[PDB]
Amino acid sequence: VLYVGSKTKEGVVHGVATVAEKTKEQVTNVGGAVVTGVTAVAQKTVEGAGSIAAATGFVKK
Amino acid sequence: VLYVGSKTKEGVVHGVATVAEKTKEQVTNVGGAVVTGVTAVAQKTVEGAGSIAAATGFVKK
Amino acid sequence: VLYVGSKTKEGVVHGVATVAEKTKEQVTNVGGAVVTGVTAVAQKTVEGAGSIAAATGFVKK
Amino acid sequence: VLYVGSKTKEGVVHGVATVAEKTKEQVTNVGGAVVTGVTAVAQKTVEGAGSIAAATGFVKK
Amino acid sequence: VLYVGSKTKEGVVHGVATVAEKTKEQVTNVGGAVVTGVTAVAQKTVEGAGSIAAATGFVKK
Amino acid sequence: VLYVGSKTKEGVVHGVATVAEKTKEQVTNVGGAVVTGVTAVAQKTVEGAGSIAAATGFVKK
C-alpha cells in the first residue's frame, strides 16, 4: 500500500577492472551455439524469463 | 497505492575499465550462432522475456 | 495511485573505458548469425520482449 | 662500432585504461610543492638527470 | 664492438587497467612536498640520476 | 665485443589490474615529504642513482 524505496540496487555491476592479454584466440562453431567473453552485464526482468548467457543447440518439434 | 522511489538503480553497470591486447582473434561460424565480446551491457524488461547474450542453433517445426 | 520517482536509473551504463589493441581480427560466417564487439549498451522495454545480443541460426516452419 | 637496433622500446607506456569517479577532490597548498594525478607518462634522458614527479619544498643558500 | 639489439624493452609499462571510485579526496600541504596518484610511468636515464616519485622537504645550506 | 640481445626485458611492468574503492582519503603534510599512490612504474638508470618512491625530510648543511 506504501512502498518507500531508497538507494536500493537491483541487478547492478560496478567497479570492474580486467586485463586480457592473449596471443591467439579462436572459436570454431558448426551448427550449434557459442557464447564467449561476457563481462560486466546486468539486467532486471519483471514477469518474464530472463537469461544472461544462454546457449542452446537447436529446438525441434 | 503510493510508491516513493529514490536513487533506486535497476539493471545498471558503471565504472568498468578493460584492456584487451590480442595478437590474433578469429571466429568461424557455419550455420549456427556465435556471440562474442559483450561487455558493459544493461537492460530492464517489464512484462516480457529478456536475454542479454542468447545464442540458438535453429528453431524448427 | 501516486508514483513519486526521483533519480531512479533503469538500464543505464556509465563510466566505461576500454582499450583493444589487436593485430589481426577475422570473422567468417556461413549461413548463420554472428554478433561480436558489443560494448556499453543499454535499453528498457515495457510490455515487450527485449534482447541485447541475440543470435539465431534459422527459424523454419 | 656497429649498433643494429630493432623494435627496441625505451621509456614507453602503452595500453592503459583508467576510470576515476570522484565526488569531491581538493588540494590545498601553502608555500610548498604538490604533484597530483600523473598517469601514462614516459621519457628518456641522455647525459642528464631526469625526474618524472619530483616535488621539493624550497632550495635555500 | 657490435651490439645487435632486438625487441629489447627497457623501462616499459603496458597493459594496465585501474578503477578508482572515491567519494572524497583531500591533500593539505604546508611548506613541504606531496606526491600523489602516480600511475603507469616509465623512463630510462643514461649517465644521470633519475627519480620517479621523489619528495623532499627543503634543501638548506 | 659482441652483445646479441633479444627480447630482454629490464625494468618492466605489464598486466596490472587494480580497483580502489575508498569513501574518504586524506593526506596532511607539514614541512616534510609524503609519497602516496604509486602504481605500475618502471625505469632503468645507467651510471646514475635512481629512486622510485623516495621521501626525505630535509637536507641541511
UniProtKB/Swiss-Prot annotation, chains A, B, C, D, E, F:
Its annotated compartments are: Cytoplasm; Membrane; Nucleus; Synapse
Ranges occupied by sequence repeats? 6-20, 21-31
- 4 X 11 AA tandem repeats of [EGS]-K-T-K-[EQ]-[GQ]-V-X(4): annotated segments: 1-31
Q: Write out the PTM section of this UniProt entry.
A: Phosphorylated, predominantly on serine residues. Phosphorylation by CK1 appears to occur on residues distinct from the residue phosphorylated by other kinases. Hallmark lesions of neurodegenerative synucleinopathies contain alpha-synuclein that is modified by nitration of tyrosine residues and possibly by dityrosine cross-linking to generated stable oligomers.
Tissues where the protein occurs: Highly expressed in presynaptic terminals in the central nervous system. Expressed principally in brain.
Q: How does it assemble?
A: Soluble monomer. Homotetramer. A dynamic intracellular population of tetramers and monomers coexists normally and the tetramer plays an essential role in maintaining homeostasis. Interacts with UCHL1. Interacts with phospholipase D and histones. Interacts (via N-terminus) with synphilin-1/SNCAIP; this interaction promotes formation of SNCA inclusions in the cytoplasm. Interacts with CALM1. Interacts with STXBP1; this interaction controls SNCA self-replicating aggregation. Interacts with SNARE components VAMP2 and SNAP25; these interactions allows SNARE complex assembly and integrity.
Read off the domain note.
Answer: The 'non A-beta component of Alzheimer disease amyloid plaque' domain (NAC domain) is involved in fibrils formation. The middle hydrophobic region forms the core of the filaments. The C-terminus may regulate aggregation and determine the diameter of the filaments.
Q: Which disorder does the record name?
A: Genetic alterations of SNCA resulting in aberrant polymerization into fibrils, are associated with several neurodegenerative diseases (synucleinopathies). SNCA fibrillar aggregates represent the major non A-beta component of Alzheimer disease amyloid plaque, and a major component of Lewy body inclusions. They are also found within Lewy body (LB)-like intraneuronal inclusions, glial inclusions and axonal spheroids in neurodegeneration with brain iron accumulation type 1. Parkinson disease 1, autosomal dominant: A complex neurodegenerative disorder characterized by bradykinesia, resting tremor, muscular rigidity and postural instability. Additional features are characteristic postural abnormalities, dysautonomia, dystonic cramps, and dementia. The pathology of Parkinson disease involves the loss of dopaminergic neurons in the substantia nigra and the presence of Lewy bodies (intraneuronal accumulations of aggregated proteins), in surviving neurons in various areas of the brain.
Functional summary from the UniProt entry? Neuronal protein that plays several roles in synaptic activity such as regulation of synaptic vesicle trafficking and subsequent neurotransmitter release. Participates as a monomer in synaptic vesicle exocytosis by enhancing vesicle priming, fusion and dilation of exocytotic fusion pores. Mechanistically, acts by increasing local Ca(2+) release from microdomains which is essential for the enhancement of ATP-induced exocytosis.
Q: What is this protein called?
A: Alpha-synuclein
**Top-level taxonomy:** Eukaryota, Metazoa, Chordata, Craniata, Vertebrata
| Whole-protein residues included | 37 to 97 of 140
